[PDB]
Design a protein around this ligand. Structure first.
Ligand SMILES: *[C@@H]1O[C@H](CO)[C@@H](O[C@@H]2O[C@H](CO)[C@@H](O)[C@H](O)[C@H]2NC(C)=O)[C@H](O)[C@H]1NC(C)=O
Ligand SMILES: *[C@@H]1O[C@H](CO)[C@@H](O[C@@H]2O[C@H](CO)[C@@H](O)[C@H](O)[C@H]2NC(C)=O)[C@H](O)[C@H]1NC(C)=O
Ligand SMILES: *[C@@H]1O[C@H](CO)[C@@H](O[C@@H]2O[C@H](CO)[C@@H](O)[C@H](O)[C@H]2NC(C)=O)[C@H](O)[C@H]1NC(C)=O
Ligand SMILES: *[C@@H]1O[C@H](CO)[C@@H](O[C@@H]2O[C@H](CO)[C@@H](O)[C@H](O)[C@H]2NC(C)=O)[C@H](O)[C@H]1NC(C)=O
Ligand SMILES: *[C@@H]1O[C@H](CO)[C@@H](O[C@@H]2O[C@H](CO)[C@@H](O)[C@H](O)[C@H]2NC(C)=O)[C@H](O)[C@H]1NC(C)=O
Ligand SMILES: *[C@@H]1O[C@H](CO)[C@@H](O)[C@H](O)[C@H]1NC(C)=O
Lengths: 106, 50, 170
């Protein structure tokens, strides 16, 4: 409706008997392949991303936002737990880091 | 010639692979929309008969 | 072919030119309408040869290779259910190319989500695309993943009911 791509903002310009809209939009570029999974199996529990998506560069699993590649460590703060690992089709095994773990470790 | 609808592009679909963008382009596009016309009035008596 | 009639018709001026120009405008407007509706992608996408979409069946909407017209069964049913100076101009886009455009749109929305409409087509698994759509309507991803078989069965049943309802209603 407001240009091709993900619309950010627009500018109006007067024209003889008309209007010209300059649509400023966000276009994704330089995409890269990653190996993805619906959920992460850890401690007999299924972890799902709160807002992002699980990606793998070949050996390590990360969670990133869907529209830009920004890999972050899979923790309990960016994932939520629902059910065990027996129901979700395609769940993979990976560790889930806990930020609280070094606090009681020390 | 018979027209080509578009350049062929086969998306590499598989059940466990995703494509994530690593960059972006800020694209500005133009959209021209007419708003009004010339306001014309015709004197019917003068036009037909003068 | 009456020359006296045309000689008398020339007294009325450019009425015929106005009528021809209006009809020409309508005729190009129809092609513009088809261009705006169907030609919204400049890449012709195709589905993979293996139709593994996590239990989701799209055979009723994907093109049938057995048919020479390359139409879907639903599109084939839709085409079956529709039955002095005059000329009929052919449409600029044939039915085969409009079917090809719909096939490209279906392949893009199945294999790439909504990414192809906003930029380059980024591949994503279909049970993940569905989960994204679930998150769009405010339902958590887990609900989709846990009940993926039931949702796929319901979707296939609904698509079959659509074909049956179109085939059974005049
Ligand atoms: C996937 O990304 C991870 C994290 O960026 C990579 O792990 C790093 O690999 C480099 C190269 O040997 C090491 O120096 C770093 O110490 C590693 N970091 C961690 C946290 O282990 C991993 O190698 C990448 N895999 C591929 C196939 O590119
Ligand atoms: C992911 O981890 C689970 C849990 O350890 C693995 O499930 C085990 O699979 C072995 C091999 O068949 C069985 O003998 C165990 O009894 C299973 N344990 C449970 C709790 O189900 C699963 O195989 C692992 N997946 C991968 C790909 O390594
Ligand atoms: C992600 O991986 C796929 C599979 O290797 C890549 O798709 C191939 O791209 C080459 C380059 O033109 C084609 O010749 C192959 O036919 C493609 N394979 C299939 C199955 O279509 C894809 O290009 C990769 N994506 C990125 C961004 O590198
Ligand atoms: C993202 O794309 C931008 C292009 O808009 C890249 O910026 C260019 O980077 C090259 C490499 O140093 C420079 O020579 C160009 O002058 C840059 N262009 C502009 C407009 O700044 C940017 O590097 C890309 N980033 C990544 C991570 O790929
Ligand atoms: C997808 O749906 C199609 C049609 O609903 C299935 O095709 C049917 O398969 C059965 C079993 O072989 C046949 O008896 C029917 O005649 C087929 N219908 C048609 C219209 O051809 C297909 O099996 C489903 N699954 C897959 C994986 O394609
Ligand atoms: C993807 O398909 C392969 C078979 O080609 C299967 O072994 C694998 O488990 C599937 N993965 C998912 C996540 O469905």
């Amino acid at each position: 409706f407001c240009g091709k791509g993900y619309h950010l903002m627009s500018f109006p310009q007067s024209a003889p008997h008309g209007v010209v809209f300059l649509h400023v939009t966000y276009v994704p570029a330089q995409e890269k392949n990653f190996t993805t999974a619906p959920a992460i199996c850890h401690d007999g529990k299924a972890h799902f991303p709160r807002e992002g998506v699980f990606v793998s560069n070949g050996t390590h699993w990360f969670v990133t936002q869907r529209n830009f590649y920004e890999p972050q460590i899979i923790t309990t703060d960016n994932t939520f737990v629902s059910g065990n690992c027996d129901v979700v089709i395609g769940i993979v095994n990976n560790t889930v880091y806990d930020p609280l773990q070094p606090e009681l470790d020390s | 010639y018979t027209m080509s609808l578009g350049a062929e592009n086969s998306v590499a679909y598989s059940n466990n692979s995703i494509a994530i963008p690593t960059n972006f382009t800020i694209s500005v596009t133009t959209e021209i929309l007419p708003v009004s016309m010339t306001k014309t009035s015709v004197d019917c008596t003068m036009y037909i008969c003068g | 072919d009456s020359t006296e009639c045309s000689n008398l018709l020339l007294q009325y001026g450019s009425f015929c030119t106005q009528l021809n120009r209006a009809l020409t405008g309508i005729a190009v407007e129809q092609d513009k309408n088809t261009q705006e509706v169907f030609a919204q992608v400049k890449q012709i996408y195709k589905t993979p040869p293996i139709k593994d979409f996590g239990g989701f069946n799209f055979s009723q909407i994907l093109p049938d290779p057995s048919k020479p017209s390359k139409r879907s069964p639903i599109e084939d049913l839709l085409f079956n259910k529709v039955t002095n100076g005059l000329t009929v101009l052919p449409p600029l886009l044939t039915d085969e190319m409009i079917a090809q455009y719909t096939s490209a749109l279906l392949a893009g929305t199945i294999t790439s989500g909504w990414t192809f409409g906003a930029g380059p087509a980024l591949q994503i698994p279909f049970p993940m695309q569905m989960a994204y759509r679930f998150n769009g309507i405010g339902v958590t991803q887990n609900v989709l993943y846990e009940n993926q078989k039931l949702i796929a069965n319901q979707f296939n049943s609904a698509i079959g009911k659509i074909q049956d309802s179109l085939s059974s209603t005049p």
